[PDB]
From a paper:
The Microrchidia (MORC) family of chromatin-remodelling ATPases is pivotal in forming higher-order chromatin structures that suppress transcription. All MORCs share three features: an N-terminal gyrase, heat shock protein 90, histidine kinase and MutL (GHKL) ATPase domain, a central CW-type zinc finger (CW) domain, and a divergent C-terminal domain (CTD) with predicted coiled coils (CCs). MORC2 possesses multiple DNA-binding sites that undergo structural rearrangement upon DNA binding. Importantly, MORC2 mediates chromatin remodelling via ATP hydrolysis-dependent DNA compaction in vitro, regulated by the phosphorylation state of its CTD.
We determined the structures of MORC2PD and MORC2 ATPase domain with (MORC2PD-DNA, MORC21-603-DNA) and without DNA (MORC2PD, MORC21-603), in presence of AMP-PNP, at overall resolutions of 1.9, 2.5, 2.4 and 3.2 Å, respectively, using cryoEM. We performed electrophoretic mobility shift assay (EMSA) with MORC2WT and MORC21-603 in the presence of IRDye-700 labelled 10, 14, 19, 24, 29, 34, 39, 44, 60 and 90 bp double-stranded (dsDNA). Both constructs of MORC2 bind to dsDNA longer than 29 bp. Interestingly, almost all CC1 was missing in the DNA-bound cryoEM structures indicating high flexibility of this region upon DNA binding. Upon overlaying these models, we observed no conformational changes within the ATPase domain. In MORC21-603, we observed a significant increase in deuterium uptake in the ATP lid upon DNA binding (peptides 81 to 109), indicating an increased flexibility in the ATP lid region. The presence of DNA with MORC1-603 also reduced deuterium uptake in CC1 and nearby regions, transducer-like and CW. This suggests CC1 and nearby regions form a high-affinity DNA binding site, somewhat consistent with previous mutagenesis of the CC1 loop (point mutation of R326, R329 and R333) that prevented DNA binding. The observed flexibility of CC1 inferred from its absence in the DNA-bound MORC2 cryoEM structures and crosslinking mass spectrometry, suggests that CC1 may aid in binding and compacting DNA.
Author numbering:
A (entry chain B): 1 to 288, 365 to 510, 519 to 528, 534 to 551
B (entry chain A): 5 to 288, 365 to 514, 519 to 551
The structure:
């Protein structure tokens, strides 16, 4: 469309320090990790394995590896990775979470100094090496990223510039944890399917005490934050397992941390007397309703608040709205969930907030109004608040104190919330009337049975 | 040699991506204000040039008299991450080489920057409209330089300069070299910068996100003021007033100076609690100033500054987290050096959440210490507050405007004021009727500090001790 040529004009160029600048957006390391998990999901990965390869010769002592069997990346897609702001996912009606062409870079540079990405597709295996260590050691102001490609069957380099490929592979072997083509190929074989991605973030960030920010020792099945948990802390904020469990409102991709599947869950289904309220979005209709799902978290009443999902991705968690902002038990314990499309509210640079604060607060006020409506609809006054709560084992006067673990109260709580579960093979969510490692439809029903989704009672506002 | 290797390159959409970090449009503006400050500007004028042919209806202009930029610096503007400010023992607020771009792209589609210095005047045109209209996936930024004396182009590629100026005239609000030179002459001094963000963002209702009509002396958010909303979040005037813990640069919004203030000076019974941050020495201490906001009890909470720049404000810590009135109304201030905590991408949070929470817990402990020290609750918190005019029970209601109360409050808080000539912060002994006028040192009744050469008497804040 340009009327002339702009080859001689200056271009806005990235610098090695802008990688750290980009990383600083993640005050939530779990958001930084969620960026890679979102990339894996958008890659149509059926599972993402988030494990740690111990490496004492690397800062932090271990590499953080995100292995997914998604669509992978061809050489052109891998090149487009380092095209900041480029996102083929940013398309109308897209269900993909990536739109900013920035999540992978920001999250990886927040988690660790460098990240080496191995991706595989139809007939090509590409390694993307974003080595901040390389830049620091060689005084590179630009952001140079080797992108060697091999033929996935012959392992022969697929390139037009042999010298370019040689330099790329030499840099990878020199500054990466994989010092030989044999090690590079070994990391490529960790993608067993025809396509998949293996994002390895190494030289992790260290706290002031020299230890990594991510604690993987206190719980080998979890990636925790290396920091003492005050009773007021939220598992989704101190435990990456808990965070990834509710990281998506419609979790299809399985998430494994250190080889142990994360029991992904739908708060829409894990609640007592859930109810959907339709809210008409003037912005949504102008650019084209929302579904405010409310329910009492009987299992843990202190883990209440609104869980705002944006394009099925968790942005705001435990967001207190409506009467919850007051001092009192009114609407205490009620959990709200909403999947906000991108036409309504877009996420922030770190995808831990919403760019349009005005409309985000409008949504929060609407959700508070609907939360009060839900509280009236369930009409706990018909029962009474204290009697209602102690019915589920909350005998203690304390609010954050978990309910008594008597089998009576356990059955009382469980009898109301159906125990949904995802099949490890067909990825569909099932139900049972009345497991950590694995489960399939046959263990009630079969993998071909249509997904009988949770139909929620519909309420109305006013 | 790595000339053959791929380079991580920016894309036009990355401008919006970078902009999305600013969920606080006032933080987006504060980015440009911080750039002006770092430029050693003694004055930044944040005015609105009405332009109905541009999206938003008006142009947002940030005119400063700082050091300006030479052609090399202007080129380094579009080098994302490039920041010469990022140096040790540096009072500069810029470190990320990103603030200008993120803030400008959050505020509006495009921004045209006019900077002047030694005899070279440079115009940086980051036109997202240009890229949208001509299908550029890159980020092409014209950077023509003229000789500030002869206004003759200073360039090596005449065709490059011609293309740059053509793009500026074609996609910018200034369609002629005459208009460009007018905007350059808006920098009267030998050096200065004029950042004009135009094609502003529009809310759903089609109006700009910034309200410059409700109060012609302020840049408000075009959105109602819920009682809970803070002036620093609905009024850029107040936000810029408390935007720096040590304000030197004068902020003028629409031509009217912003009455910059130091909460340290503007508090009752201020006390400096020194906190020895182990992180400071580990990465190699802080000063937690606490005071009761007698004028506005509800405007309490910690005001955490980072390198003299406001990051977190009204941050409830310590007993304030409890619903009780303990430590209610106490404002806290801390200028966190960059060595201790660094800010987030948007400069509205802190990158190290763990250590930021450690600092918040320390500030809460020191806040309880200050509460006990002043012993106002010991003598009776309700009577203490109603003595200053809060005879009512609602914590959000302001104090009674009776002159008796007004005097009771103003007596405790000494009145400080900045001279509009030497930028030195003077303190006066009696109540002042006055918006910020053109007050200068010469008009100070106190003879010890009736001069612009008189040394600035810094505040003699008492130093408390913890434990
Ligand atoms: N695991 C993966 N599998 C397949 N493609 C991937 C993977 N990770 C990254 N990519 C590709 O690389 C691009 C850049 O990643 P990223 O920096 O996360 O930007 P984005 O995902 O497009 N958008 P956002 O997540 O909103 O910043 C993606 O958009 C994908 O095209
Ligand atoms: N008003 C100004 N006066 C002088 N120099 C300026 C001005 N605005 C920008 N610059 C220069 O342009 C650079 C880029 O600005 P910016 O994108 O704000 O990055 P930064 O200010 O270096 N760091 P940060 O503000 O933390 O992102 C600055 O660092 C200055 O060198
Ligand atoms: Mg992504
Ligand atoms: Mg700046
Ligand atoms: Zn199945
Ligand atoms: Zn003076």
């Amino acid at each position: 469309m340009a009327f002339t040529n702009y080859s001689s004009l200056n271009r806005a160029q990235l610098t090695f320090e802008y990688l750290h600048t980009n990383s600083t957006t993640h005050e939530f390391l779990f958001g930084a990790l969620a960026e890679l998990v979102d990339n894996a999901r958008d890659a149509d990965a059926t599972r993402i394995d988030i494990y740690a390869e111990r490496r004492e010769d690397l800062r932090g002592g271990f590499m953080l590896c995100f292995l997914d069997d998604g669509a992978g990346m061809d050489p052109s897609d891998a090149a487009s990775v380092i095209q900041f702001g480029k996102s083929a996912k940013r398309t109308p009606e897209s269900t993909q979470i990536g739109q900013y062409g920035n999540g992978l870079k920001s999250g990886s540079m927040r988690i660790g100094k460098d990240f080496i990405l191995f991706t595989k597709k139809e007939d090509t295996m590409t390694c993307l090496f974003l080595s901040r260590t390389f830049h620091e050691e060689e005084g590179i102001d630009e952001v140079i990223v080797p992108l060697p490609t091999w033929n996935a069957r012959t392992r022969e380099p697929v390139t037009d510039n042999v010298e370019k490929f040689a330099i790329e592979t030499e840099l990878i072997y020199k500054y990466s944890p994989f010092r030989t083509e044999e090690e590079v190929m070994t990391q490529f074989m960790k993608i067993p399917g025809d396509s998949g991605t293996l994002v390895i973030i190494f030289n992790l960030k260290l706290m002031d005490n020299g230890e990594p920010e991510l604690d993987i020792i206190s719980n080998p099945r979890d990636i925790q934050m290396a920091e003492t948990s005050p009773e007021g802390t939220k598992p989704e904020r101190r435990s990456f397992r808990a965070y990834a469990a509710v990281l998506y409102i419609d979790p299809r991709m399985r998430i494994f941390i250190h080889g142990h599947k994360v029991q992904t869950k739908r708060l829409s289904c894990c609640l007592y007397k859930p109810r959907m309220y339709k809210y008409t979005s003037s912005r949504f209709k102008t650019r084209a309703e929302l579904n405010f799902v409310f329910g009492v978290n009987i299992e843990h009443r202190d883990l209440d608040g609104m869980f705002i999902y944006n394009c099925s991705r968790l942005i705001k968690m435990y967001e207190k709205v409506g009467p919850q902002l007051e001092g009192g038990m009114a609407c205490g314990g009620v959990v709200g969930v909403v999947d906000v499309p991108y036409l309504v509210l877009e996420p922030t640079h770190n995808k831990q907030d919403f760019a349009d604060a005005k409309e985000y607060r409008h949504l929060l006020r609407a959700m508070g109004e609907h939360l009060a409506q839900y509280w009236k609809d369930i009409a706990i006054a018909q029962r009474g608040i204290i009697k209602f709560w102690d019915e589920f084992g909350y005998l203690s006067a304390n609010w954050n104190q978990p309910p008594s673990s008597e089998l009576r109260y356990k059955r009382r709580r469980a009898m109301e919330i159906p125990t949904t579960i995802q099949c490890d093979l067909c990825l569909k969510w099932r139900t049972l009337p009345f497991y950590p490692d694995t489960w399939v439809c046959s263990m009630n029903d079969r993998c071909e049975a249509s997904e009988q989704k949770q139909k929620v009672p519909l309420g109305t506002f006013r």
